[PDB]
Design a binder for this molecule. Structure first.
Ligand code: HEM
Ligand SMILES: Nc1cccc(N)n1
Length: 289
């Protein structure tokens, strides 16, 4: 299965910057969401979940086809709550109806990371909507009540190695868990992208508790939480080393997250040798907007 990137006809960097800016301005405007977290974190999670269906073995799933728009995938229990991100993006899509769905969902995550003061994430256009029959079945996204060996095996399907896994999970500095979505509750409610995930893992005093859904999670007295799969990153000695690295080097974390997150968003896509180079969007702040 080959998915060849095809640039939306006649579009260039300055078209996609406009879309980025519309997303970014709406992120600033719609600030009340989720007790004043705003939509940044949910957009990052949307971009990940639309990408994380990918299977390297047969090139099924992935961001290219925009298949989250279809009910089988929209309704995946693993995607509960992401409808809020889709609803955020609907006026953006109405303004810019020429962008493909996969391009919009992936660009929403890039825009969110950058506007939350995270790294620059180079981004490539040309995902093409594919039909409803190409929608992957539910069950391809990961469970949270598992251990490091589970996490490591899971991510091999996505062609991610230990460093890439640990870097990607730093996104768990953002937003929160919600009991009614996933059966986990709590988190920093943070809407600034930092390396805090790693510092919290190493620094807090964690206790293994049960939540009101009868699931185990790690809680800190400071009011933070970790999923079992997050905590596994300090139980496994290989992950632990990388957690320490990122807890001690903000810039390295930023660079490695950027590389892994673009990768994630590009898995499954064949870019022609003459395709445009990746775009690096300016933030609103860099534009004086
Ligand atoms: C083993 C891998 C992972 C597991 C098991 C996992 C699981 C979860 C769960 C259970 C939630 C809470 C959802 C809710 O209740 O609303 C969540 C939230 C979140 N996840 Fe992950 N995740 C994983 C990897 C990732 C990766 C790779 C990223 C992106 C790079 C990511 C980004 C997010 C973000 C940003 C949120 C917060 C959403 C919000 O505040 O609404 N996750 N994740
Ligand atoms: N904010 C957040 C989201 C997912 C998992 C964790 N540990 N925390």
């Amino acid at each position: 299965l080959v998915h060849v990137a095809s640039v939306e006809k006649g579009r260039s960097y300055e078209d996609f910057q406009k879309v980025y800016n519309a997303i970014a301005l709406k992120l600033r405007e719609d600030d009340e969401y989720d007790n004043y977290i705003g939509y940044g974190p949910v957009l990052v999670r949307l971009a990940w979940h639309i990408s994380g269906t990918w299977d390297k073995h047969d090139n099924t799933g992935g961001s290219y086809g925009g298949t989250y728009r279809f009910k089988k995938e929209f309704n995946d229990p693993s995607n509960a709550g992401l409808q809020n991100g889709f609803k955020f993006l609907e006026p953006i899509h109405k303004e810019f109806p020429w962008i493909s769905s996969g391009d919009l969902f992936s660009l929403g995550g890039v825009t969110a990371v950058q506007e939350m003061q995270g790294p620059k994430i180079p981004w490539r256009c040309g995902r093409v909507d594919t039909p409803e029959d190409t929608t992957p079945d539910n069950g391809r996204l990961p469970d949270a009540d598992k251990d490091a060996g589970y996490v490591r095996t899971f991510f091999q399907r996505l062609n991610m190695n230990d460093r890439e896994v640990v870097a990607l999970m730093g996104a768990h500095a953002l937003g929160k868990t919600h009991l009614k979505n996933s059966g986990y509750e709590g988190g920093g409610a943070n809407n600034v992208f930092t390396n805090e995930f790693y510092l919290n893992l190493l620094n807090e005093d964690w206790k293994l508790e049960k939540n009101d859904a009868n699931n185990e999670q790690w809680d800190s007295k400071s009011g933070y939480m970790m999923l079992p799969t997050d905590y596994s990153l300090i139980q496994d000695p290989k992950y632990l080393s990388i957690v320490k690295e990122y807890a001690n080097d903000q810039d390295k974390f930023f660079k490695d997250f950027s590389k892994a997150f673009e990768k994630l968003l590009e898995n499954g896509i064949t870019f022609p040798k003459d395709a445009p180079s990746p775009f690096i969007f300016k933030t609103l702040e860099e534009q004086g907007l």
